[PDB]
Amino acid sequence: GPEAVYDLGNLAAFDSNVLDKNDLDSSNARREEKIKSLTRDNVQLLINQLLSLPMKTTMTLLQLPDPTTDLPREKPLP
Amino acid sequence: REAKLVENVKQALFIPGQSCNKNLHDIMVDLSALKKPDMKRFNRKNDIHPFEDMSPLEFFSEKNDCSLMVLMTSSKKRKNNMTFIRTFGYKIYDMIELMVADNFKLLSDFKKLTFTVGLKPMFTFQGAAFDTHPVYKQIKSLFLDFFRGESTDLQDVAGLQHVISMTIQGDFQDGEPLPNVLFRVYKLKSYKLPRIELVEIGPRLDFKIGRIHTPSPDMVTEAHKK
């Protein structure tokens, strides 16, 4: 049961827990309940992370950290 | 649009291919809607074969200023095939075929709920291979890049509306077939921190992984340069 990893600047949560193909098989009648349930648990954790960030009020704003996932630019650096 | 130190939001161009059918067009319309307002689409078909001639994609990317493209084709061999393409300096960066399984669901298959357009999405990725397998790492990079929208330092709590969820269809050992990737979109609800509940809004897509094109090491260095 590894801990979830967060990239809060991208509002993203990463879950490396074991997944069982029998729970998610296209013929499994409860596959969507299982997918939604997993997503719901990870969204709860993500929201809890986001809501513990420093906040401003101008309406309430979170101060997101810089995104950490390495994503390619669309154009070369000037 | 000239290069910038802080880049614009990536724009996506959806391209019906010659063999695009009605089902595929409906999928395209609903998935492209999620990328609004940073989205363009062609109304007519184009005869594109990405793995035999990438040239028309590079021209489209430059002409329409879209560094993200999705081509829609279908054959008996590759049914409901969505080829996702990213460019760097308008040249092909990577491509991957993601073929939509027959169990897909459209927006119309879910009870209509209000949906504010243009909000930044949350993401949850379920599956260890998204961090360690070269194919699933590309898929995670692609979908974050594709849908994350505007980068911001201030996030409005009230705009935390929906989540894009991507799940690998079970763990797998090397040598086994690569499992499908399960794409889901949910809107948040809550009740009293509150307990979050989710309601699916669609589209619901199961992607079967096809062929890939990856960048040379030189291009990687260029594209990821700080």
Author numbering:
A (entry chain B): 16 to 73, 87 to 106
B (entry chain A): 19 to 210, 218 to 251
Published text:
The 5' region of pre-rRNA that consists of the 5' external transcribed spacer (5' ETS), 18S rRNA and the internal transcribed spacer 1 (ITS1) is co-transcriptionally packed into a terminal ball of ~40 nm in size. These particles represent the earliest assembly intermediates of 40S and are known as the 90S pre-ribosome or the SSU processome. Within 90S, the pre-rRNA is cleaved at sites A0 and A1 in the 5' ETS and site A2 in the ITS1, yielding a 20S pre-rRNA intermediate. The fully assembled 90S contains an unprocessed pre-18S rRNA, U3 snoRNA, approximately 51 assembly factors and 18 r-proteins with a molecular mass of 5.0 megadaltons.
